[PDB]
């Protein structure tokens, strides 16, 4: 290992090019059937605290 080093400065277009795939997918939400509030699917609605049409957590 002889300390590899970046040969040249990365041009701006190339930098942004590598950052192309850096997008953040929006977190997909579904409305809580209890309180009509959006929240991640397959989780407890922290608003109503219900899940599977029944109560789970104490909001």
């Amino acid at each position: 290992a002889k300390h590899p080093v970046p040969k040249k400065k990365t041009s701006k277009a190339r930098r942004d090019a590598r950052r192309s795939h850096h997008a953040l997918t929006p977190p997909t939400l579904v409305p809580c059937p209890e309180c009509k509030a959006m929240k991640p699917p397959h989780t407890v609605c922290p608003e109503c605290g219900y899940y599977a049409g029944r109560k789970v957590l104490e909001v």
């Binding site: 953040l24 929006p26 939400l29 991640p40």
Partner: protein, 112 residues
């Protein structure tokens, strides 16, 4: 009308929070609220506070219809980096740039 709030001097990496803010550009206000509330990102919090704050400004100050509110345009200017030192191996020292960020949110009443 366009409302606007700005988190001036937010101690956070600008490039990081830019990824968050670029996720709510052009969204309805409710949409952006929910998206912020469930986005696993530290910048998402600051974007949240600036977002709701912009909502208050659009309502109280500029008196816009909160229903038609959407993120017309938001972005993150970079702020004065706080230069600190990271003691590295063999005596030498680095200088980490603890970057500060300015957040700008801009709201309009989408019509139709």
């Amino acid at each position: 009308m366009e409302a606007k709030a700005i988190a001036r001097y937010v101690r956070i990496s600008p490039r990081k929070v830019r990824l968050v803010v670029d996720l709510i550009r052009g969204k309805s206000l409710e949409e952006a609220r929910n998206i912020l509330r469930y986005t696993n990102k530290r910048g998402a919090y600051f974007v949240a506070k600036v977002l709701e704050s912009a909502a208050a400004n659009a309502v109280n100050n500029h008196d816009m219809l909160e229903d038609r509110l959407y993120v017309k345009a938001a972005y993150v200017d970079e702020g004065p980096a706080l230069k600190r030192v990271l003691p590295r191996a063999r005596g030498r020292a680095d200088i980490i740039k603890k970057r500060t960020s300015h957040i700008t949110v801009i709201l309009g009443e989408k019509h139709g």
